[PDB]
């Protein structure tokens, strides 16, 4: 079944008549985390390229 | 009669002395919303050695390890409250700016004389007769004497007098011989140096006072007391009954007075070896708690501080030459029931002080005011419909001692 | 003139009110809802159970 977001936050000063609506939300998060960079270094066509 | 400056007239005020001195850094912000209404401290540890022709420990017995405490709690509200008719109060007295300047001072006096009221209670040590004042310069170096006697070292020790000792004592610096310096100055500012006689010694107008309490008859002790370590590892108190006193008179031993066993002496703590006073023996003496009336048949029971351990299964924590028993002889230092103001010694490490920060009341407007590091709450509300508004000041301090043997009072010797 | 907000469950809202008394120290919280109920038609609606 569907369950939806609660704001309250509209409806204020207004009717609603249509109940057919499903509240999704996307979440961000910014994480720093451990990663390992590999070096191919092929002299050919410039050397350094991590 | 009609036009009055906007200038208020100087008033009286105390000087702060004690605060400053007292150990404010091991109890500082510990009592939160976590720890509760109070906190505890360790103690140190003590061992005895066993000698013996072959180190055989065999069946000897071998040193314990006992844990000691020491709690410190918070005290009573420190509020002062007024209430006024806006209409007259705001009639020359404008943003309501003139309550400030005597309330944090009255809230900061009260402060500090309670807070010398707790250290006389609970100080043990005693020097001099009460009623001999403090003439020449042994009777402020007998204190250093007594507590390098003892073996306190990790600290520093100070002395608060009043206002006319100094000036005894500065006419008594007038009089030197050699040192040009020091003559000139107790001529010209009549002001003592900074060491006199090893030790720290402070002026202090504001000062607490006690009185004696009516007392009378060659009192004894009856039973003889606990005094183990167990008993007294937490808060170093031991009650002792007395006989031998008057027949029925309330008020037998005021908060304050200190009790002189004769027969028992101080130990130096170390090398558990006796004191001794240049001619006599030092004897052992405790202060009493809280008051005390005697019944008929001359029976007092008492509370003390300060106590004469013996333990007899853990000898590294005895501090006494003997046990107190059954039939020994005491008596009471001063007369009948005067009044004097008592002067202070004490090393660093004898009296703990802090104050707890308090919330402001919900949907009631308030500010902060702080004097010489104390913050005080002021709130405001109108209670009542009839013009009346009501401001309130808090402040709630805690105390903690960590060891009785380590100050108390001292007087002049004749 | 008394610190208020709104809370918010599973689509309700609910009024938090904070406020205390100067004389006694002490502080008090209370929360507040006012719901309101109808009846459109007793026809529609009743209470099913296992028939023999």
Known sequence: ?50 | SQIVLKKFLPGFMSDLVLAKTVDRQLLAGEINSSTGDSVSFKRPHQFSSLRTPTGDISGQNKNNLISGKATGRVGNYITVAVEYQQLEEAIKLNQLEEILAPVRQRIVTDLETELAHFMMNNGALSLGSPNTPITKWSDVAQTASFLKDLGVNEGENYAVMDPWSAQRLADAQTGLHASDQLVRTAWENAQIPTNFGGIRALMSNGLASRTQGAFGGTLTVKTQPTVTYNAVKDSYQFTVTLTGATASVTGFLKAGDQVKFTNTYWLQQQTKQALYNGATPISFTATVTADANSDSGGDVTVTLSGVPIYDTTNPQYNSVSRQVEAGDAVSVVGTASQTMKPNLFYNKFFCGLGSIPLPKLHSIDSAVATYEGFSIRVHKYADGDANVQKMRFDLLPAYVCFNPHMGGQFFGNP
């Open chain 1, 1 to 50: 079944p569907t369950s939806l977001d609660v704001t309250s936050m509209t409806s204020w000063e207004y009717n609603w008549f249509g109940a057919d609506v499903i509240y999704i939300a996307k979440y961000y998060e910014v994480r720093k985390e451990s990663v390992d960079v590999i070096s191919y270094r092929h002299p050919i066509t410039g050397e350094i390229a991590t």
